[PDB]
Amino acid sequence: ADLSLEQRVGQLFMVGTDAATAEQVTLDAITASHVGNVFLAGRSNAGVDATAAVVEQLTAAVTDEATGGVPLLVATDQEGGNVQVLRGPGFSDIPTALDQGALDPATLQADATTWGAELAASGINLNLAPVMDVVASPEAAAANPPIGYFHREFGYDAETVASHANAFSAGMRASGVETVIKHFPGLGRVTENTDTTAGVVDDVTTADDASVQAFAAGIDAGAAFVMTSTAVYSQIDPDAPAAFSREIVSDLLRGQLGFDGVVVTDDVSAAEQVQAWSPADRAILAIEAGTDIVLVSADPSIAAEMVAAVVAKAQADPDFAAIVDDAARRVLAAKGVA
Numbered sequence: 001a002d003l004s005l006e007q008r009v010g011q012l013f014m015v016g017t018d019a020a021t022a023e024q025v026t027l028d029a030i031t032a033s034h035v036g037n038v039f040l041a042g043r044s045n046a047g048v049d050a051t052a053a054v055v056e057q058l059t060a061a062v063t064d065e066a067t068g069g070v071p072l073l074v075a076t077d078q079e080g081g082n083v084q085v086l087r088g089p090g091f092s093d094i095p096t097a098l099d100q101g102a103l104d105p106a107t108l109q110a111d112a113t114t115w116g117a118e119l120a121a122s123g124i125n126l127n128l129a130p131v132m133d134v135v136a137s138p139e140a141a142a143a144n145p146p147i148g149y150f151h152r153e154f155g156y157d158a159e160t161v162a163s164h165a166n167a168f169s170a171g172m173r174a175s176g177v178e179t180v181i182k183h184f185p186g187l188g189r190v191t192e193n194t195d196t197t198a199g200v201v202d203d204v205t206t207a208d209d210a211s212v213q214a215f216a217a218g219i220d221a222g223a224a225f226v227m228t229s230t231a232v233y234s235q236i237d238p239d240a241p242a243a244f245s246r247e248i249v250s251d252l253l254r255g256q257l258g259f260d261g262v263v264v265t266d267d268v269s270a271a272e273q274v275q276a277w278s279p280a281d282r283a284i285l286a287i288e289a290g291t292d293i294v295l296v297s298a299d300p301s302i303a304a305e306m307v308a309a310v311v312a313k314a315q316a317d318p319d320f321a322a323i324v325d326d327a328a329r330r331v332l333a334a335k336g337v338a
Contacts, residue, residue, distance in 0.1 A: 008328035010034030016297030019044035022057035048090030055123030096151035105167035112171030130165035133188035162217035182227035186211025194273035250290035270298035280309030
């Protein structure tokens with residue numbers, strides 16, 4: 001499969017649709033903008049069959065003209081507990097990751113195999129989970145708005161987090177669903193939420209942090225996708241949101257930690273932390289940092305103009321074009337495509 005420039009850029013985006021409807025904006029993003037991946041957003045109670053029917057409409061938009069026949073990555077947020085997009089008939093009520101952390105990894109892996117089978121039956125093949133963020137301690141947990149507050153952490157040290165998230169990943173893969181470990185280099189220690197607040201700075205997480213050790217164990221155990229944080233990490237790179245940091249994404253994650261797979265941004269569409277940048281610059285900066293998939297979930301209406309901006313810069317700028325081409329190659333390889 002030899003994709004056009006437009007189609008290769010299209011592979012570097014993941015555009016949201018509401019979990020209960022194949023939204024026209026998403027369908028257009030695939031057909032007119034060649035977007036190659038989708039994400040089911042919100043909280044749906046419709047159940048497995050209704051979700052499969054949504055996904056079927058989305059995958060029906062893959063054509064040779066749309067994506068060169070390349071199939072969609074179809075993702076959702078199925079962590080469990082406070083973050084379970086897909087619920088209802090045929091779906092388990094998945095416990096919080098914190099509860100999952102109290103299970104023998106063997107038991108968690110078995111339960112995650114079940115959870116994965118439900119995802120796969122509804123047409124999902126990528127889970128944006130497990131969370132491998134490490135929260136400092138159970139007493140500090142409530143003070144951490146994205147992870148701790150919501151019980152999305154598996155535990156409070158690298159070993160516990162590693163053994164449970166890797167168990168979760170293993171069961172997920174055993175049912176045909178790849179995982180995305182998140183959020184590198186670790187979101188368990190910020191005191192504000194990047195969704196709703198800007199200028200979020202983590203002042204304690206270093207490259208030696210337990211969370212970075214957790215991610216390493218995720219990568220060593222075979223992780224194929226990693227999602228990056230948009231927080232600013234004072235002790236690693238204070239000059240940019242992590243997702244836009246060449247140093248964090250390429251030198252630390254790909255270089256030091258040796259990750260060869262696909263790097264996914266946290267949602268950059270509506271998260272307050274990155275609204276200071278135009279949608280076009282969010283995409284461009286992510287990609288230049290070493291990102292392979294720009295997540296545009298909450299507000300899919302801006303996907304079209306981001307795609308166009310990334311195409312136009314590839315046409316004008318040979319260094320960025322070469323970066324784009326490497327990214328598309330990781331994405332096609334994760335999809336098993338030549």
